[PDB]
Amino acid sequence: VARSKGYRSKTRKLLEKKVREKGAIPKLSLLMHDYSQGEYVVVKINPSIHKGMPHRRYHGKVGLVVGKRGKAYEVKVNIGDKERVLIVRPEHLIPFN
Amino acid sequence: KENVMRRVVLDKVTVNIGVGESGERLQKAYQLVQELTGVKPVYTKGRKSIREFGVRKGAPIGVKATLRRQAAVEFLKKVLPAVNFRLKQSSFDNYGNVSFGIAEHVLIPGTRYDPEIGIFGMDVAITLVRPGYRTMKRKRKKASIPRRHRVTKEEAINFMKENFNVTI
Amino acid sequence: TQGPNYRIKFRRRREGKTDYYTRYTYVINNAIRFVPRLTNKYVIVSVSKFDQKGDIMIAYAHSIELVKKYGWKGDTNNTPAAYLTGYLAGLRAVKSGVKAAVSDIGLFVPVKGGRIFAVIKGAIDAGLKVPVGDLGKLKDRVNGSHISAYAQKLKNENQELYNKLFSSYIQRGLDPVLLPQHFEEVLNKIKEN
RNA sequence: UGCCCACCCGGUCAUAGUGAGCGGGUAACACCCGGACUCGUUUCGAACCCGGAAGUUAAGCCGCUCACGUCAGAGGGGCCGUGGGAUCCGAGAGGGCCCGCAGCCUCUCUGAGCUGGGAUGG
RNA sequence: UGGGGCGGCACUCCCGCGAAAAGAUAACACGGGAGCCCAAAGGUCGGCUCAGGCGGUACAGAACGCCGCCGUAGAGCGCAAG
RNA sequence: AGGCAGCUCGCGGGGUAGAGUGACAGAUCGGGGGCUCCAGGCGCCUGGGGCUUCCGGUCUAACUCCGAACCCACGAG
């Protein structure tokens, strides 16, 4: 049988949360930084924040910030040879390096 | 003298009437406890439904009234003479509580009559407290108190022998 | 605690001091906060700013420096004292550079006519634009008119309100009845600098 | 002065936690005293809110000891994997060698609160 | 379509596993679901804490109401699974 | 006028082999102590059942308090 291609399929363990990270958002110090254009970020999905959540295929990728729309950011990521632009809420981002 | 802060005080003498249903008995039970205490009572909702015993969620099945300082002691002085020998050492827990039931309300040494309303039973709960218990029930910076500061069973008996001259 | 399946709450949540659900909203929206705290004897006001390593104070004000700098004589944590501390806080904040701020009640209950709303109103008169609903305090409480009426009922219980304080036995002439008159002379003193 | 000790707002979110027992305050933090007024309890000035100040270190809070928890370092013990190679072994299951990397559990011992911004005390 | 037929639907969609710790990946493989329901089971604001157990209370009983102690979730969140 | 099929360093992502079971869910073999009922024998003894507690043992494609080799994104060389 071929697999169902829902939005959150084959994510039983990617969207786990370890016992010491559970609860409504713990880390506020990452949210106190305002990314400017040209910065590098890492797309890290937060399983407990259900707004502005990216797709499984982008978890752990490194993007470049190119703009801002509201409270969410426009991030340019490479998948293969293709450029893709995402709009991600800052709860799903960490700075790179 | 820090011993003044370890004193035992009376607090929250609560009267409960459990009729076990809703309608045609609550009001007369509501009227009954209205004059025993002198304060307006409250209906008590039931917990999770059982579908037997007739209880269901949100259904008022009981009436309670809470008395505080300088009126709790007066009310206790008029219900105790009925059951002076009913109070037992086994009915005291290890945290400063004691409870006793009244089988028949007119048994009280008061001006009770037998109108067409009928007769009910009563339950009385007595809570013994020390100064500083506010730390468990305040809103901000609430904490917990150790067993060191709690009222013990042995000293709770003394508070009943004194100020009330109760037996056993 | 029982082992490897137990998760510990935040330290300020365990102490019962901070509400992190409201604090989450401020950080997302990058608010500059005006924080009117209270205690059993004083009132504390601070104007904060978010930072990675901890909040930066922009301005500060305490009720102890009402008596040590402007000759306040009444209680240090009643409604007229809440207004005066807030007025002083707004003057320091505006002089420091900020012109608007967001109220941060904390874990206090927002009751109309209370001390917390008195602090906010005092800061508004000083010139700090704090958004507020049309349901603030009452103007007869700020000057202490309600305190004087209670003192003026000394005729029955033979006791004036202001019993002598901890050290006011031989130093402070408490006069609760003439409290509103004492209010504006202090207010005019901080209004000029 | 001083530096660090509480308090207000925090960051890290158990090496920081939980329980028990003890130590410490003439200020600060609290319990505490009372309700005319703003406000309030489907009853209760208990809680919330307002006004106060006699009393106390007994609670909370801070520090210390001991039990368990947690994170590491060291030591004894149980289990054990893997990327590349060969006309290597073996009927196969599997195994050995060459070059390249490790891991998990359990006992025993030893430690265990750091830190940014502002008004009281030493 | 392990010839076709009979059967089934692996013929549209969703969850786990197959799947080899990025991505992609087949079987007439395995374990199951959807084709709706709700004017509230939707929006916001406030207060509160759940299942289970222990001590004391008339009828009261494992399980009615009241007074206390513990409880990291062992509950609940329309319906499958996560 | 730059490009990336390869490698190194830096900085991140992951839940597989293994390993555990008192860390959740299921399965699974024995012993000691305490409580209770039933049956048999002369208050005691023996057997069966249920609960609790402590000690050891066996497992998991649709278990995880853990966790390699390895693979991958980005920057520089």
Numbering used by the authors:
A (entry chain L21E): 2 to 98
B (entry chain AL5P): 8 to 175
C (entry chain L18P): 2 to 194
Any passages from the paper?
The ribosome is a large macromolecular machine that synthesizes proteins in all living cells. We present 10 cryo-electron microscopy (cryo-EM) structures of the archaeal ribosome from crenarchaeota Sulfolobus acidocaldarius (Sac) at 2.7–5.7 Å resolution. tRNA and messenger RNA (mRNA) translocation through the ribosome, catalyzed by the elongation factor aEF2 in archaea (known as EF-G and eEF2 in bacteria and eukarya, respectively), is an important and complex step during translation. Moreover, the structures of archaeal 70S ribosome complexes support the idea that the mechanisms of the translation elongation process are conserved in different domains of life.
During our termination complex formation, we first incubated aRF1 with aEF1A·GTP and added them to a ribosome–tRNA–mRNA (with UAA stop codon in the A site) complex. However, after solving the 50S LSU structure from this termination complex sample, we found the density for aRF1 and E-site tRNA. In the 50S–aRF1 complex structure, only domains II and III were traced from the EM map; however, domain I—responsible for recognizing stop codon—was flexible, and no density was attributed to it. However, in the Sac aRF1–50S complex, the long helix containing the GGQ motif in domain II swings 18 Å more toward the P-site tRNA CCA end, causing a steric clash with the canonical P-site tRNA. A structural comparison showed that the GGQ motif undergoes significant conformational changes to overlap with the backbone of residues 74 and 73 of the P-site tRNA. This finding suggests that besides releasing the NPC, aRF1 can dissociate the deacylated tRNA in the P site from the 50S ribosome after translation termination. Furthermore, inspecting domain III of aRF1 showed that it binds to the L11 stalk, and the L11 stalk RNA backbone is 7.5 Å away from that in the 80S ribosome. However, in the 2.7 Å aRF1–50S structure map, H68, H69 and H71 from the starting model fit very well with the density map, indicating a conventional structural conformation in this complex. In the aRF1–50S structure, we did not find stretched H68 and H69 from the inter-subunit interface, suggesting that aRF1 binds with the 70S ribosome first and sticks to the 50S subunit after 70S ribosome dissociation.
